Design a protein around this ligand. Structure first.
Ligand SMILES: Nc1nc(F)nc2c1ncn2[C@@H]1O[C@H](CO)[C@@H](O)[C@H]1O
Ligand SMILES: Nc1nc(F)nc2c1ncn2[C@@H]1O[C@H](CO)[C@@H](O)[C@H]1O
Ligand SMILES: Nc1nc(F)nc2c1ncn2[C@@H]1O[C@H](CO)[C@@H](O)[C@H]1O
Ligand SMILES: Nc1nc(F)nc2c1ncn2[C@@H]1O[C@H](CO)[C@@H](O)[C@H]1O
Ligand SMILES: Nc1nc(F)nc2c1ncn2[C@@H]1O[C@H](CO)[C@@H](O)[C@H]1O
Ligand SMILES: Nc1nc(F)nc2c1ncn2[C@@H]1O[C@H](CO)[C@@H](O)[C@H]1O
Lengths: 231, 229, 231, 229, 231, 229
C-alpha cells in the first residue's frame, strides 16, 4: 500500500494501534518475541512479533482522525487485518474517572465531520465490536485490573477555543482523545473488529496531571489487557 | 407531573418502557404479581407490580423521540426513577440479524435533531449503561437466549422517502426503531441507567415478515431477560 | 395498514386528529351520531360517526412529529383521507394571544429535522390548505367565536434546555405544540388538505395557567369550528 | 437613511415593493395622482402619490434577499412604514398554477441562510400578515380576479445547478422568486404587516412562456388588488 | 439574455462590475471614449466604451450575492465575457486597513448559503484569478498607489443582528461587502477570470466615517488600477 | 510544550513544515548547515540549521488537520514562530495542473469541521500571507521554476467514499491535500504569516503517476523556492 511498507504476510490478523510510533517500537520490543520492523515509511513504525506464540503487529497511527483513517484503511484493504485494538491515552473530563482506570470505549462522540460528510442529516454513532470489548472486560476483571466502560469524545483540535467538553461531561462522556471515532467507523464499514483501550493522561477540567509512575503502571495494564482480548 | 397521574411512591425504581400501552398492560398482567394501574392519562398506561420480591413499573411511552422524551423526563425528574429499560421491537436492516436474535443497543445513530439542538457541531453518540447491559447479556447467556450486541438507528420518519438505512446497514447498524437515542441521552444527562432490549419485527430491506409465533417467542425472551437486568 | 385496524370504508374523507386518544373518544361520543370504534391498535383510538348527516372520523395521533407522521401517512396512503384537521392545544408564548382565542395555524416553524432530511439546504415552510383555513375562519366569525391566524412552532422536545421560543416570540410566532409541521408537510406531499386548530393550554413565558373551565369552553369552540370547515 | 434619500414625511404608511425600479415608476405614474419621486440613490426609485385619498409609496427593492432586506429595514426603521406589500412575479413550478392566477404567499421556503444565521437548528417559516392577506383575497374575489393562495420558494441563485424546485413542486410549492422570505421575516421581527402578491412570468419546469399580453393583464390585476389590501 | 438588453458584440471581453448602476454610468462617462448604453433593463445600466483604444464595458450589478450572480452568469453564458473586475467599496473592520488603501481581495468568506447548497459538507473558498490580481498589484505599486491584499467577507445582511465580524476581524479578514464570494465562485465555475478591487467606505467597528473627498480620491485610484489590470 | 521537546531559542523565526519527518531530516541535512535535531518526541523530528546566514527550522507535522494543528499551535504559542511555510505534495485534480508545476495556495476549501466549529453559519476562507506568497512567486520566476497559483482542497479522509473532488475540479480547485486550511487559519488567528508550497504526487482523476525522477526534481524546486520566501 501507499503509507505502509510491508510485504504480503508481514502483518498479523490482530494489530495494536498506539498513537505514537515510538510507543509502537517500545511495545514491540518489550512484550513481543521475534520482532521485525515491516514499515519505516514516514517514521510511522510497524512491528510484528509473537505473544505466547500468536502473531501480533503494532503500528503507530499518528494523531487525529485523518492519520488513523489512512492506516486503518490500508491495514484493512491491503493486508486483510481482522482485529484492530487501539491502545492510547485520553484526557479524563469527569471527577469519577480515576487515574489508574483502564477505559474501554463502547462508543465515541466527535466534532469531526468525517461522518456528517458520509451521512449528512444522520448522527452516526460508532460502535465497538462487543466480542473484543467483552474479552477485554473479562481479562481485566480476571486479574482484578480496575476498568471502566463507556463513551469517549474524538476531538479534531487539541487546543480548542470553542471546547464543549464541559457539556459532554454532563452527559456521562468519560474522556477526550482524537482517534476512536475514525477507528470504529472504518472497522465497522469493512466488516472488521475494533476496540479502544485508553489510559488517563490527565484530568482536563482541573489541570491536574498524572505522575510518570502512575502512567507507567496503567500503560502496562492496558497493553496486558489488550494482549488477552482476541478469541 | 403533566403526563403521568401517579402519586409519590407508586412508581418503581426500575421501569420497563414498551412503546405500546397495551403491551405494557400485557407485561404487567402476565409477569407481575400485585399490580396497580397508576396512570390512565392519555390512555398511556403505567402499572406497578412485583417480580421476585421487587417492585417493577411498566410504562407506555408512545412512538417517537418526542414522546418517549416526555415520559422519560417525568419518570426521572418527578419520580426519581433509577433504571429505565426499553423493551420493544425494531426492523432488522441486515441479513446476519436473524428473527430470533434479541438485540441489546450499545449505542444508537439518529436522524433526530434533538442532540444537534443541544451540541451544535458535535455528533453525540448516546451510550447504554454498561452494568445494565452486562447484566442483560449475562442473563441471556445464562438461559441460552440468542443475543446480539451492537447499534440501532433511531428514526423520526417511520416512512422515510430519503431513507439512509441502506448506508447504515453497511456500517454495521443492526436495526431501526424510534426511541433509543432519546432514552440513552436523557438517562445519562440525569445520571440514571438506561438500556434498550429489542426483538425483530421484520427484515426491512428484504421486506420479509416474522410469524406471530416467532414474535411471541422472542417477546417472551425479551421480557425474561429484562426482568434480570 | 400497520398502525390502524380499520377495514375498507370505516374511515371518512374528513378526519379530526387530536393528540390524545381519550379526547378522540370524548369527541366521538359527544358530537357524533352512530359511532363505531374502527381502531384500538396501541390504545390509539379511531372512531367514525356522522355530524349533521356527514361522515367524520376522529383518530388520536399521539405526541410528537413521528407519531402523527405515522397516522397521517397511513390515513392518506391506505384509507385515501382527503381532509385532515388537527384539533389540539398549544402553549401561548406572546402576551397578546389570549386564553379564549382559537388559533388557526397558517404555517409552522420547527426544530424537527424531518424536513432538513428531505431538503437539506432548504428551509421548508409547511403551509395550511387555505380552503380549509378560510372555512374555519368564516365559521368562527359567523358565530363571533374569537379567532387568531398566524404561525406556530412544532417542538421536538417538551422540556427543552436550549429553548429558543424567546426568539420565536419576537418574530410574531403564536405558540408551541408538537404536530403541525408534520401534518402540513405530509398532507401537502400527498395532495391532501390540512389545517390545525389550536386552543391555548397555558402561557409558557409567564408560567400562567388557564383554568379548567376556560379550557372546556374553548375546546367546545374549537371542535365546533372544525365541524363546519369542510366544503 | 443610507440607501433612501427621503426626508421625514415623504414616505407613506403603506409601501408597494416591486423588484424593478422602472416597474415602480410605472406603478406610480399610471395608478397614483400627485406623485413625487422621493429617492434616486442608486437609481432605485421610490415615489409617493395618492390613490383614493390615501398616500401610497412605491419603492424598488432590487433582486435578492440581501437587496430587499436593506430597503425593508430602512423603510421600517427610518420611516416607520407600517404596511409593506411586495408586488412582483415568480416562475410557476406547477401545472395547476395557471398563467393568469394571482398568487398570495401565506409563507415561503428558502435556500437563504438568513434565518439559520438567526436561529441555528430551527426552520423559521415566515408568515404573511393575515389581515392584509384576507383583504387582498377579498378584493380579488369582489372583482373576480383569479387568485391562488399557498407558498412560494425564495431562491438565492436564479441559475441553480443544484435546484430543488423539482422536489418543492411535489410538496405543494406554487412558484419561485427571490424576496418574499426576507420581507415576511423582517416585517414580523419589527411588528409590521407584510404580504406578497405575485403574477406568473413563466412555467419553469415546462420552460414555457407567458405572452406580453398575459403579463400586462395579470400585472394590472395584481396592482388593482394590492391597492385595496 | 433575460436581465441584459445588449445585442451580440455590445459587451467587451473585460467588464467592470460596480454595485451602483449610477456609478457605472459615472465611470463610463468619465474614463471611457465613444460610450454606448447597451442595457437599461431594470435601471441596471451597462455601458461600453474604449480606454486607450481597448474595449471595456461597465455593468451595474445591484447589491447582494443573488443580484451579482444573475449578471455575472448572464455576462458569461450569453456574452462570453472573459475578465470580470468588481470595483466597489467595503466596510473596514480592522484598525490597520486605512481609509486610502485600495484592497485587492484574494479570497472571501461568507454567510451566504450559495456554496453550502452546492457542496454541502465542504467549505468552498473562492479564489481570485492571480493573473488579474498580480497585474492589479503591479499597476498599483508602479504608480505608488497604496494597496493591501487579503481576504474579505461577503455578508448576506447589511443590518446583521447576529454579526460575527468581531470574530472575522481576529482572523485577519479585512472588510465586509456583499458580492465578492458570488463573483469568484461563478467566474471560477465557468473558467473565467475575476478580481475585486475595493475602497474603504467606513470603519464598521468604531462607527468612524470616511470623508467625501477621501472617498473621491480612492475611487479614482481604484478605477485607474482596474483599468491597467488586463494582460 | 507538550509535543515539541525544544528549549527556548532552539527554534527559528522561520519554520518549514513538511508532512513527513524523514523528509524534514532530508531537507535539514541536504540544504542546511550547522544542523541540530531539537525534537524526537513521537519521532516527529525537528531540525534547526542555517541557510545563507539565517536560521531555518524544519519540522514534521504528520498527516491531517488535527496533527498539523497541534504543531502549528505550539510553534506559534510556545516558540513565537513568525513564518510558517508548508512544503509538501498534493494530488492534482485537474488536467491543466501538470506534474512539474509548483503550486502556491492562495486559499483552501475543506471538508474539515474545524472552522464551522469556530464560526457556525460562516464559511471561513483561509488566506495565505500575501507577502510570503509574492516572495515565493518572485523567487520562482527569478529562477524560471514553473509555478501555478490558486486553491487547494484540504481533505480529512484520504480515502473518501463520498468524494467531492469531481465537483471541486469544476470550480478551479487545483489539488487535494490534508493540512493547508489548518495552517492558514491558525497562522492568521495569531497574527503570523503562513504559505503552502506544493508539488504534484499524482493525477487523482486519471489515477496516473508521476515518476520518482519527476518528484525529486519538483521537490528540489519547491525547497529552493521556499528558502527564498
Ligand atoms: N487531554 C487530551 N486531549 C486530547 F485531545 N488528546 C489527548 C489527551 N490526552 C491524551 N491524548 C491523546 O494524545 C495525543 C495528543 O497529544 C492524541 O493522539 C490523543 O489520542
Ligand atoms: N421496521 C421498523 N421500523 C421502524 F422505524 N420502527 C419499528 C420497526 N419495527 C418496529 N418498530 C418500533 O415499533 C414502533 C413502530 O410501529 C416504533 O416505536 C418502533 O420503535
Ligand atoms: N406548552 C406546550 N408545549 C408543547 F411543546 N406542547 C404543548 C404545550 N401545550 C400543549 N401542548 C400539546 O400537548 C401535548 C404535550 O403535552 C402535545 O401533543 C402538544 O401538541
Ligand atoms: N422564474 C423565476 N425564477 C426566479 F428565481 N425568480 C423569478 C422568476 N420569474 C420572476 N422572478 C422574479 O423576478 C426577478 C428575477 O428576474 C426576481 O426578483 C424574482 O423575484
Ligand atoms: N460597511 C459595509 N457593509 C456591507 F455589508 N456592505 C458595504 C459596506 N460598505 C460598503 N458596502 C457595499 O455597499 C453596498 C451596501 O450599501 C454593497 O453593494 C456593498 O458591496
Ligand atoms: N493524492 C493525494 N490526496 C491527498 F488527500 N493527499 C495527498 C495526496 N498526495 C499527497 N498528499 C499529501 O501527502 C499526505 C498523504 O500521504 C498528506 O499529508 C497530504 O498532504
Amino acid at each position: 500500500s501507499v503509507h505502509i511498507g510491508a510485504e504480503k504476510g508481514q502483518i498479523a490478523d490482530t494489530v495494536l494501534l498506539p498513537g505514537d510510533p515510538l510507543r509502537a517500537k517500545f511495545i514491540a520490543e518489550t512484550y513481543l518475541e521475534n520482532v521485525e520492523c515491516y514499515n519505516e515509511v514516514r517514521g510511522m513504525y510497524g512491528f510484528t512479533g509473537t505473544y505466547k506464540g500468536k502473531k501480533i503487529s503494532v503500528q503507530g497511527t499518528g494523531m487525529g482522525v485523518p492519520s488513523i483513517s489512512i492506516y486503518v484503511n490500508e491495514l484493512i484493504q491491503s493486508y486483510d487485518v481482522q482485529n484492530l485494538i487501539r491502545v492510547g491515552s485520553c484526557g479524563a473530563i469527569r471527577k469519577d474517572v480515576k487515574v489508574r482506570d483502564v477505559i474501554l470505549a463502547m462508543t465515541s462522540s466527535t466534532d469531526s465531520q468525517m461522518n456528517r460528510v458520509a451521512f449528512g442529516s444522520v448522527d452516526f454513532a460508532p460502535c465497538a465490536d462487543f466480542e473484543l470489548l467483552k474479552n477485554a472486560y473479562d481479562a481485566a476483571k480476571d486479574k482484578g485490573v480496575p476498568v471502566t466502560v463507556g463513551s469517549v469524545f474524538t476531538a479534531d483540535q487539541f487546543y480548542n477555543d470553542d471546547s464543549q467538553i464541559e457539556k459532554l461531561a454532563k452527559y456521562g462522556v468519560l474522556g477526550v482523545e482524537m482517534e476512536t471515532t475514525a477507528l470504529y467507523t472504518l472497522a465497522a464499514k469493512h466488516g472488521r473488529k475494533a476496540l479502544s483501550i485508553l489510559t488517563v493522561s490527565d484530568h482536563v477540567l482541573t489541570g491536574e496531571e498524572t505522575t510518570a509512575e502512575e502512567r507507567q503502571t496503567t500503560f502496562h495494564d492496558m497493553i496486558d489487557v489488550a494482549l488477552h482480548s482476541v478469541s
